[PDB]
RNA sequence: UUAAUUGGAUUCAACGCCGGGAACCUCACCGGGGGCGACGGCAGGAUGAAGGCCAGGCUGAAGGUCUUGCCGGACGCGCCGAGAGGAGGUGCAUGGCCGCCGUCAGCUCGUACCGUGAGGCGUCCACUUAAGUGUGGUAACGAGCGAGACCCGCGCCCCCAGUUGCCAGUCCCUCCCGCUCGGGAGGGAGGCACUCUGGGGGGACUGCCGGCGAUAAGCCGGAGGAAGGGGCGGGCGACGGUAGGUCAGUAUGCCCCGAAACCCCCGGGCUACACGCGCGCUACAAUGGGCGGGACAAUGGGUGCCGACCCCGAAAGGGGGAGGUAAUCCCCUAAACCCGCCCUCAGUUCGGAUCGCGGGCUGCAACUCGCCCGCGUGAAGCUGGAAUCCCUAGUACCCGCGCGUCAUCAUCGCGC
């Protein structure tokens, strides 16, 4: 049951809608653009907000934002 | 020469790792050799408990366990740098021991 | 070997902290700390009271060396005595503050709601507390009283939180006190921020 | 002599050679690598001699 | 049943449980013997109180008493109150701890609204999740603790390290075989290549394709990958309830004991046996029993202790005794497995209970009641009625090992 958790989405949609040029939609690139943006410590907490992320743009630039 | 032979060895992880650069740095800024901190195997003690007072219940148990980590280093002796190693202040958590062979 | 060393010299502690606990009962005992240095060794007391632990000018302090030197190892004590750390974050001096109010003869919500307007008010991020004995009655009870944030379980309230335990004999029988504060500077794992440009 | 007949004897083995260092108590003693406690003061004083619990 | 066979626990959640493998002690139980009143006052006291002994009776044994007479130098249970001490009562007077509902998904708060009120709403509906975990609609809009996050191990790669760990490629010497062209075994010189030990980083995110579902939450299948859909195994148990267990681990109020129910010492009991029950160990044989050879482990422990090596003994064991305060020395060449020979379907070369005699170890003491060895005797048992238990992968089953308890004794607990 891999369901995003609720901390994650409230603060992947704020660093989403405060620099919307800085994301790609590649993994590895995201993944290495996260860690010195924010102040995270942790390893896979990073990894799963990268993956929202990519999510996100691909969802939002190819059309209807849900 | 006759190649000193120091032995720390402590419980706290990250209280060891900066004699342990002292050490180093020690050696380094005067003019001798030395054999970087050789790990050596951690020696943990275990201690299996019940948990209840009585006897009723159901049996669940504790495992209290207590890591001591040790390390070996090897230098020669310059008494320019064998004197240097005397005011290093240990913590009080470290044990240090030194022989030469 | 070397663990017949460490765990020796690690009871001693244990001994010397419980016995000062019980004897420097009033004055708040904060704890102690054992410097180990040539030639002898080093103690240190941060009690709540110097005035009462050294003494009528030094007349008790000779006492107490020469019984943690004489039952106890230590075989060159030097005690001093000094002024606690941050005695409103520290839950085992106001478990006995609460236990000493209570037996004095305040009642048992007085207590808790200045100790706890103390305490939030010196800086905490939350705290709180729990009495239970046969308080009011003759069956016994339980209360509690919180006030923010404070994690019970995890990891991360096993090391951050602070927590103590005390007695207070009365006359119809015991009363059990039980604090727990979290220190001004809590950092949870959830609270990720965006360092910004 | 009335101090013959309030004194023990001097036993060296069995469950009445070694008593609790901070209760009293004889029976269920820990004697691994030196340290002399109950099993239930043990229980109780842990995390303050050092040790931890990882599983 | 007994002088005593001390107590607590009775469905799940009492019965190899109280770390409970009790010779003395542990000990709380039956028989016997002897000691103990800080402190205030009373009979008395330097014409000498309290208080102590060579020898001998009583006694299981004892200057414990008495016989005998020596000593010591101030106080006094022969009297009153009090006070130590209590494994004595009460877990239905309490604290602390722990089991179970339950690692279940619950339990509340601020303000606003609905009811005269107890109360309600949020916390409801629809789909989805291991989950009050989410996505939509809504008199509700936001929050807190629990869940997830957090901590420790396992599997793959890279850097830094090279002794007490490892020895592949070079270099000498010694020794063996088809007599040597070839192959093999030890040393010692050198090196951290490989394994290993352990600090720091990398790696996996429903990220990438196809199909469901709305196009959202999410769910199926496929790649590439050491690993895939909480990566696998653990730690951490919310507000409350259970008059659940523990006063016999410590702490503790009230009531009884107080020259005793307090403190010591010797001998007995908890080990008694027409009987009902719980959990296990060995078998009822060939999917085997015996005899001789051949193979390969990991966790852990040692100074009151671990014992290599040599020599006596048929075996248990005995007399010496290097090296070890530890990656160095020791415990420590595991068993199920394989090859060769005997047995051939039988209460047997299956099964080894029960008993006789002889030799040893620990101990202050082995009869009641310790453990170990050699020869002999050889009980029930031929697959189990109605019923009932545990297990989803390096898991169940089968075989051995190490710690704990410990002066000796493991059919047990916890790990490999
Ligand atoms: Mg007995
Ligand atoms: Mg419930
Ligand atoms: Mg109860
Ligand atoms: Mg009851
Ligand atoms: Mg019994
Ligand atoms: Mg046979
Ligand atoms: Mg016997
Ligand atoms: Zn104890």
Redesign the interface.
């Known amino acids: 049951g891999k369901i995003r958790q609720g901390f994650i989405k409230r603060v992947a949609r704020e660093l989403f809608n405060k620099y919307p040029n800085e994301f790609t939609r590649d993994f590895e690139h995201n993944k290495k653009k996260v860690e010195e943006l924010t102040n995270v410590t942790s390893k896979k907490i990073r990894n799963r907000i990268a993956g929202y992320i990519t999510k996100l743009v691909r969802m939002k630039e190819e059309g209807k934002i849900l | 020469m006759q190649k000193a032979r120091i032995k720390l060895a402590s419980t706290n992880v990250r209280s060891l790792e900066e004699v342990a650069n002292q050490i180093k740095q020690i050696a380094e800024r005067t003019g001798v050799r030395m054999s970087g901190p050789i790990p050596l195997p951690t020696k943990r003690i275990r201690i299996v408990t019940r948990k209840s007072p009585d006897g009723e219940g159901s049996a669940t148990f504790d495992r209290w366990e207590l890591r001591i980590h040790k390390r070996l280093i090897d230098i020669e002796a310059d008494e320019r740098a064998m004197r240097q190693i005397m005011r290093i202040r240990v913590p009080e958590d470290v044990t240090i021991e030194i022989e030469l062979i | 070997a070397?663990?017949?060393?460490?765990?020796?010299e690690?009871?001693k502690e244990?001994?010397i902290?419980?016995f000062l606990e019980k004897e420097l009962r009033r004055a708040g005992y904060g704890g102690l700390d054992?410097?180990?240095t040539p030639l002898g060794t080093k103690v240190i007391i941060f009690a709540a009271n110097p005035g009462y632990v050294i003494g009528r000018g030094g007349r008790r302090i000779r006492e107490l060396t020469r019984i943690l030197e004489r039952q106890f190892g230590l075989e060159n004590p030097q005690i001093d005595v000094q002024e606690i750390k941050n005695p409103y974050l520290n839950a085992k001096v106001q478990a006995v503050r609460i236990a000493q109010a209570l037996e004095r003869g305040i009642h048992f919500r007085r207590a808790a709601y200045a100790a706890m307007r103390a305490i939030m008010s010196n800086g905490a991020r939350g705290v709180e507390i729990r009495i239970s004995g046969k308080l009011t009655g003759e069956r016994a009870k339980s209360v509690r009283f919180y006030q923010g944030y404070l994690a019970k379980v995890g990891n991360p309230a096993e090391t951050l939180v602070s927590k103590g335990y005390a007695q207070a004999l009365l006359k119809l029988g015991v009363i059990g006190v039980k604090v727990a504060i979290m220190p001004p500077d809590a950092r949870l794992?959830?609270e990720?921020?965006?360092?910004?440009? | 002599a009335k101090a013959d007949y309030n004194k023990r004897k001097p036993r060296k083995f069995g469950k009445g050679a070694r008593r609790c260092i901070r209760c009293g108590q004889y029976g269920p003693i820990i004697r691994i690598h030196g340290l002399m406690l109950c099993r239930h003061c043990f229980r109780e004083v842990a995390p303050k001699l050092g040790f931890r619990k990882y599983e």
Not at chain 3, 2 to 8: G, T
Not at chain 3, 192 to 197: G, L, R
């Open positions: 070397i663990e017949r060393y460490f765990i020796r690690a009871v244990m001994l902290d419980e054992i410097k180990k794992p959830d990720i921020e965006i360092i910004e440009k």
